[PDB]
Amino acid sequence: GAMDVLSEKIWDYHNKVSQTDEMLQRKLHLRDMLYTAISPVFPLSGLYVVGSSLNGFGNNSSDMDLCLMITNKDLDQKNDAVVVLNLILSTLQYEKFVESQKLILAKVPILRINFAAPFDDITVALNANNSVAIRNTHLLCYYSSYDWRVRPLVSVVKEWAKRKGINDANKSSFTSYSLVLMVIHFLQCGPTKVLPNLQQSYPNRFSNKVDVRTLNVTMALEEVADDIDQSLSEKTTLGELLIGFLDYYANEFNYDRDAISIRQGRRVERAPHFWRSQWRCVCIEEPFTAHSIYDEMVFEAIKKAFREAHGELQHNHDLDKLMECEPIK
Amino acid sequence: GAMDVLSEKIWDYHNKVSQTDEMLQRKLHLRDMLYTAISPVFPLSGLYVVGSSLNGFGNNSSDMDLCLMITNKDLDQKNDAVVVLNLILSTLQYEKFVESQKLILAKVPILRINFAAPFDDITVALNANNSVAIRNTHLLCYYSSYDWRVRPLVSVVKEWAKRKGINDANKSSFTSYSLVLMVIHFLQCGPTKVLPNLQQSYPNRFSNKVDVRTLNVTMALEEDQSLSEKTTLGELLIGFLDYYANEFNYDRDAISIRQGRRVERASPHFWRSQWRCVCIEEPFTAHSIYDEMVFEAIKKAFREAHGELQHNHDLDKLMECEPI
Amino acid sequence: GAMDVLSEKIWDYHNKVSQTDEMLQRKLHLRDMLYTAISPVFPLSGLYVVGSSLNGFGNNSSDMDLCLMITNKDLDQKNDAVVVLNLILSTLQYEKFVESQKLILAKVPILRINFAAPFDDITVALNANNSVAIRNTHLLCYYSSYDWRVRPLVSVVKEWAKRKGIFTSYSLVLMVIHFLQCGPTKVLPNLQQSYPNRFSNKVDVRTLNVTMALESLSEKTTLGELLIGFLDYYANEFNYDRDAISIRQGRRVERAWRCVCIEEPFKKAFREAHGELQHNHDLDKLMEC
Amino acid sequence: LSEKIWDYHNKVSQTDEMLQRKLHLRDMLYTAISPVFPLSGLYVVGSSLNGFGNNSSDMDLCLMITNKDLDQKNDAVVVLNLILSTLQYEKFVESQKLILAKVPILRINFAAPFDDITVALNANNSVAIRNTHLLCYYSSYDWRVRPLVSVVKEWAKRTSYSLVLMVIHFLQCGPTKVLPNLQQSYPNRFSNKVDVRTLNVTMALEETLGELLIGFLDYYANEFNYDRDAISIRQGRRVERVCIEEPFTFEAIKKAFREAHGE
Amino acid sequence: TLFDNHPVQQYSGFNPIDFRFDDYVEGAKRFDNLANLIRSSTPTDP
Amino acid sequence: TLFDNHPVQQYSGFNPIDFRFDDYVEGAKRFDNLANLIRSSTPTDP
Amino acid sequence: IDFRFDDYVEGAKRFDNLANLIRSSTPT
Amino acid sequence: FRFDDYVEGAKRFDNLANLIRSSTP
Ligand SMILES: [Mg+2]
Ligand SMILES: [Mg+2]
């Protein structure tokens, strides 16, 4: 119940749940096993790890999302990607270490894979040739790395929201990925400037134009003249960033008028890039290329949940009380 | 022990796992709830129960497979049906009894649904406008009803196969539906003549040209089968195993329930391939070198089971087997 | 062969295909019949006639697009519009004068209705609260009335594209308006830019002025030069990659899906059509392709 | 009027120069494939050897690897990927494309002096052998078949393998009977049961043009039906299940045949 | 990942789908009687 | 049901698919180093 | 009651008079 | 995996090319 112990217990919780190095190593070994199974069918292909497992924002129970790159040409996802995933399904079924498979229709078709022990705690989501996920993973991984407070803030926002039933992978539009963009937006456009607009500051590193086989994954970021005054930023504690996050979305953000763009570094007036709608109300632009009357009920529950979380945490500074909330009716 | 003791152990096991009336009523009420949710979007549609829940061969953990009928026209399954299922997904998300949904790709697009208490033990599988499953379900129901031995047999064949891992819903081509066809084929073409060919004997009831809104669902079948079966339940399970262990030739033979016979595999209907070797014709409208290992294991599991049941006549020994 | 002949020929073709006022009266009667049946379900609703049948650009076999307005808020077209249209379909299935109905899942869901009795030559396409159809129809109707040459021009351009396999009617109309804005002869102004608060997006559509009459080198040019010019413009001048049509700004714009990118108010064929018409001035030879 | 047809035919048909080049190229392919499949045989199939090809014709090849039947779903793709894995490093090969289809294909384009020849390679799909074996005897039964085929094909331009079967059918079934049912007449020679390595490619077989073309355009404009009639080559007749059963295993296209007849 | 677990809920570009509704409401209810057919073929104690 | 839980394994009538293979093998392996980027920007005890 | 309808009855009948607006700019 | 010998087979197949030249004209 004091701003220093709020900060540290945010940090502590993050450390309890964040993806361990052992877990990442087991995932990369598993990926190697899958690639040797797939390579007789696609000999020049590459199997990329994308999303949570590599973007810095994943926990010790995240899927291994994989992106099989085969061609620099576009591959149609409605029809052709289904043939490729089904062909790969056929090939993986003869493998002893593969236990079950299933073709899911997400935003793109997705081959979902589970495994025999000792890998039976890792699920794999494999997509065919969608290089946009590689660019995306790459960009978030530098947002994740830019400032030490970013990842533990995201860990706790994610878990709070899970417990309030606001982040739920079984329900459409109830995404964890969006929450990440919402945090990155806040850290760019809230009271404390913790993050720059990396797409504007380093359009060379993150260009939509660059072949993903030349993406820079080994060099730190050079500094930029006056895009983040990083010691004014450091006056703000972790604890207060969480409170500020709950405050901004509960009491400042106007979901009817405003939208979120990470690529532009600002909120925009709802007026080539796809826009997501988290819970069908929070319109959010992907960095890379009117409402149902029944949505309104759910909207009001979302906003309420935020108002309550901000009230609670601002008052008692108590992370375990915040996290001891219960879901949404 | 005895063939009468083994016959009763088979029967017992059936009654233990067979879909109860209480479960059937609960599924039917859940179907009704889903229909009222779907109705504002599709006001003249009807939500049919298809497969395990209604075809006689279900057990108490069977999915409730549903078929939403909307139009007598063909609905394209590659794209149009995904749009329909996605629309229904959006509608059902607002419902408090719906907890979780997912779009998977089976032989056709399929909406999977899970539910809040008190229906959380029921999973639903919904397809869009595929009336072939309604006909299928209608036909298998008369097969399941023709002789009291059909369903307990299928009950026990199903579980043995599950416990040996050759029946597994998470692995492709290892389906339980095909096992049913395999049993039906045996009772038609094996030593004991137990099932007729319903599609040939009753063209008028099982015709693929009948509108599914007029399928006969009330009348038992009028009189062939001499009812000359003093063959016990236990003999029929042993014979089933024997027929598939030692008489069926997987590289020469194929199965056709609709033709009521074995056909030379070198020959409008879709042929399934159970485990990628056993070719089976659907009643209604060259192997991979890596398939040999699995074929050999299937063939072996049948030889073992038949050897064991032929000897001990002991059902509980048979079901204590290990997977593959 | 001569271009006063071409001008009168274009005009004559226009008057053969144009929507007669008798056809318009029949369409309004049928609309009233639809309203009588729909009114018990939505007693405060409004059934607007939208599209070709009212905006001056329709022929006699043209569909009747209708817009049912029930709310001033914006009706979601994924779920709410399908429900509203099914609520109308549920009533119309008991009306004698209505014959068959199709629901059409599209970006904007449509209720497509066919009639009996003396109206089986008229098809209706009804949407639920898509007021942008109303704004569009209002604007186009002022373009349609601004200069007596717009409609006959549009009539033959629509028929040429039909007989040459070539693009919806609405796209073509916008191609014609754009050309008459930005071509050699400035025939039409940018109405959204000249009368900004009279065609503003932000106005309640019940406010729309429906009787305002709007307040030299152009009168020179003939129907014939207009049509030759139109075909010239899209054959040799408009870049179907570099450029797009914007009506709101009477100007072509950088394209930064479809062949001619058109922003709504709210190619060897063109080459050989221009070749033919420019050389012979023979409208019969143009539309016998 | 027959004469000009033979002119177009002799003008566009495959030269013996081109065919030597194709056989040379195929030998170059085989030199590179041999370390991978030492016992394999690389057959020429399709237009390039059955006697119905242009000079622009793809060379279709068939790599035979086993006596058994090769699964075209998984094994064929793995086999073809083993060839592409090698041809990757051969200078005379310019580019490759893997074509996922019911019969997977390795499509290959070549460098330097072989830029005009494209190869389409299937894995162990031996019915392609048989079909070209038979059709090479159909093209040599009467002198009129190959020239007729030539004009029929470029008329379609201004599928080829089906145009041919339609042509062969009309010469089996229409007004004048030019060609027999070869599969019925010499059942020993063209049996499905003969190993493809001992097919008779040596011994001959034991026992006009102007009006055949306009009769063809008559047979298919107003004389042939499409859902009561189909084409069978294995049995000479017109049978019912443009439907065509191969020797071994839509009103706009009637109005098209109709007006082309008014000539 | 950004592909999530469900299809796009916005428009997403699909072609128009013409539905002529046919009545199936009562057909679906009658089909339930199959269940009685199963009950009736079941013996109590065989 | 008839439809099982997986797409048809035999040839369903998919249209042919031209693959021009591009080399991504070493690229997919170099992408793992983002792991170092993460670890090298994590303070050991703030 | 729970959803917000608005009055368009007069609005929709008034919109018709665009017909006259076109007619009164067609030469005879 | 049983590979079989089609080397001589494939080469002898070439001489169908003679069969047609011996027919035309
Ligand atoms: Mg993930
Ligand atoms: Mg089932």
3-state secondary structure B184-200: HHHHHHCCCCCCCCHHH
Count of CB atoms situated within 10 Å of the CB of E10? 14
* Ranges of each domain in chain F: 1-46
Asked whether A and F share 3 or more beta-carbon pairs under 8 angstroms, the answer is yes
Instruction: Inform me whether the C-beta atom of residue D245 falls under 8 Å from chain B C-beta atoms.
Output: no
Cis bond upstream, residue B109 (ω within 30): no
**D243, D122 contact by CB (below 8 A):** no
Size of interface A-E (CB pairs under 8 A): 50
- Structure determined by: X-ray
Count of CB atoms situated within 10 Å of the CB of C83? 18
Phi then psi for residue C106, to 5 deg, are -150, 180
D contact set with H (CB within 8 A): 16, 19, 23, 30, 37-44, 49-51, 64-68, 129, 132-133, 136-137, 139-141, 143, 146, 196-197, 199, 201-202, 204
Q: Position of tokens 């500020």?
A: A244
Residue B254: DSSP 8-state: E
**Binding site for Mg(2+): what residues of C are annotated?**
63, 65
Asked whether H and C share 3 or more beta-carbon pairs under 8 angstroms, the answer is no
Q: Among partner residues E2, E3, E9, which is closest to A173 by beta-carbon distance?
A: E9
Count of CB atoms situated within 10 Å of the CB of D192? 12
Asked if B105's CB is within 8 angstroms of A109's CB, the reply is: yes
Q: Among partner residues F9, F27, F43, which is closest to A46 by beta-carbon distance?
A: F27
Rounded distance, CA G11 to CA C251, Å? 33
Asked if D69's CB is within 8 angstroms of B286's CB, the reply is: yes
**Both structure tokens of A174:** 């109830």
**Both structure tokens of C223:** 């129907």
| F24 contact partners, CB below 8 Å, separation of at least 6 | A44, A45, A46, A48, A69, A70, A213
**Closest to B71 measured CA to CA, from B82, B90, B84:** B84
What is the set of domains in chain A, with CATH numbers?
A: 3-13+134-323 (1.10.1410.10), 14-133 (3.30.460.10)
Ramachandran assignment for A276, one of left (phi > 0), alpha (psi -120 to 50 degrees), beta (any other): beta
**Closest to G5 measured CA to CA, from C134, A293, B90:** A293
**D133, D44 contact by CB (below 8 A):** no
The per-residue DSSP string of C142-183 comes to: HHHTT-TTHHHHHHHHHHHHHHT----HHHHHHHHHHHHHHS
Contacts of A89 in chain F (CB under 8 A): 6-7
**A38, A21 contact by CB (below 8 A):** no
- Please, after which residues is chain B broken with C–N above 2.5 Å? 223, 267, 285
What is the whole-number distance in angstroms between the Cα of residue B125 and the centre of ligand 2? 8
- D81, HSE (Cβ side, Cα atoms, 13 Å): 18
Residue to test with chain F: of D80, D98, D118, D122, most F Cβ within 10 A? D98
Gap from F14 CA to chain B (nearest CA, Å)? 11
Rounded distance, CA A263 to CA D206, Å? 79
Asked if G18's CB is within 8 angstroms of C141's CB, the reply is: yes
**A260, A284 contact by CB (below 8 A):** yes
Contacts of C78 in chain E (CB under 8 A): 9-11
CA–CA–CA angle A189, A190, A193 (5° rounding): 75
**A129, A72 contact by CB (below 8 A):** no
Q: Among partner residues G3, G11, G17, which is closest to C46 by beta-carbon distance?
A: G11
Strand partners, B189: none
Rounded distance, CA D125 to CA D109, Å? 21
The per-residue DSSP string of B151-180 comes to: HHHHHHHHHHHHHTTSS-TTSTT--HHHHH
Phi then psi for residue F21, to 5 deg, are -70, 125
Residue of E nearest to B28 (CA): E32
Strand partners, C123: C114
Instruction: Inform me whether the C-beta atom of residue F34 falls under 8 Å from chain A C-beta atoms.
Output: yes
Gap from F39 CA to chain A (nearest CA, Å)? 9
Count of CB atoms situated within 10 Å of the CB of D144? 20
Interface of G with C in 1-28 (CB under 8 A): 3-19, 21-27
| F34 contact partners, CB below 8 Å, separation of at least 6 | A54, A55, A56, A137, A138, A141, A217
Three-class SS state of D261: coil
Rounded distance, CA A292 to CA B89, Å? 14
Strands (E), B22-63: 46-50
Count of CB atoms situated within 10 Å of the CB of B262? 17
Rounded distance, CA C116 to CA C122, Å? 9
Strands of C46-50's sheet, edge to edge?
A: C46-50, C64-69, C123-128, C110-115, C98-105, E17-19
- According to DSSP, the β-strands at A275-278 and B109-115 are unpaired
Rounded distance, CA A135 to CA A141, Å? 10
Please, which chains are in contact with G (at least 3 CB pairs closer than 8 A)? C
Rounded distance, CA A270 to CA A285, Å? 11
Kindly identify the ligand whose nearest atom is closest to the C-alpha of F2: 2
Three-class SS state of B256: strand
For D100, the enclosing helix (H) or strand (E) is strand D93-100
Q: Which amino acid is at E14?
A: F
Rounded distance, CA D161 to CA D164, Å? 5
**C151, C54 contact by CB (below 8 A):** no
Strands of D93-100's sheet, edge to edge?
A: D41-45, D59-64, D118-123, D105-110, D93-100, F17-19
Is A65 labeled as ligand-binding? yes
C contact set with G (CB within 8 A): 21, 24, 28, 42, 44-49, 54-56, 69-73, 134, 137-138, 141-142, 144-146, 148, 151, 205-206, 208, 210-211, 213
**Closest to B291 measured CA to CA, from B192, B173, B196, B193:** B173
Strand partners, C183: none
Residue to test with chain B: of E15, E26, E38, E40, most B Cβ within 10 A? E38
Q: Position of tokens 């992978």?
A: A169
Residue A59 CA, chain-centre distance (Å), reads 11
Strands (E), chain A: 46-50, 64-69, 98-105, 109-115, 124-128, 258-261, 266-269, 275-278, 282-285
Q: How many residues does chain E have?
A: 46
Contacts of D71 in chain B (CB under 8 A): 286-289
Cis bond upstream, residue F16 (ω within 30): no
For chain C, percent helix, then strand, then coil, each to nearest 5? 45, 15, 40
Rounded distance, CA C91 to CA C80, Å? 17
Kindly identify the ligand whose nearest atom is closest to the C-alpha of A112: 1
Gap from A269 CA to chain C (nearest CA, Å)? 15
Residue of C nearest to E18 (CA): C104
| B191 contact partners, CB below 8 Å, separation of at least 6 | B239
Q: Position of tokens 């186009």?
A: C140
Instruction: Inform me whether the C-beta atom of residue B213 falls under 8 Å from chain A C-beta atoms.
Output: no
Q: How would you label C34-64 residue by residue, b for 16+ Cβ within 10 Å and e otherwise?
A: bbebbeeebeebbbbbbbbbbbbbbbeebbb
Cis bond upstream, residue E7 (ω within 30): no
Phi then psi for residue B260, to 5 deg, are 65, 30
**A282, A255 contact by CB (below 8 A):** yes
Residue of C nearest to G17 (CA): C210
Size of interface C-E (CB pairs under 8 A): 26
| F40 contact partners, CB below 8 Å, separation of at least 6 | none
Burial of E12 (0-12, 13-18, 19+ CB in 10 A): middle
CA distances from C207 to C28, C133, C196, C212 (A): 21, 15, 14, 12
Burial of A211 (0-12, 13-18, 19+ CB in 10 A): exposed
Rounded distance, CA B133 to CA B127, Å? 9
**Closest to D178 measured CA to CA, from D217, D209, D223:** D209
Rounded distance, CA B67 to CA B77, Å? 13
Three-class SS state of B115: strand
Phi then psi for residue B256, to 5 deg, are -130, 100
What is the whole-number distance in angstroms between the Cα of residue B269 and the centre of ligand 2? 20
- According to DSSP, the β-strands at D244-245 and D230-232 are parallel
Residue of D nearest to F8 (CA): D73
Q: Resolution, rounded to a tenth of an Å? A: 2.5
Phi then psi for residue F35, to 5 deg, are -60, -40
Rounded distance, CA B294 to CA A94, Å? 9
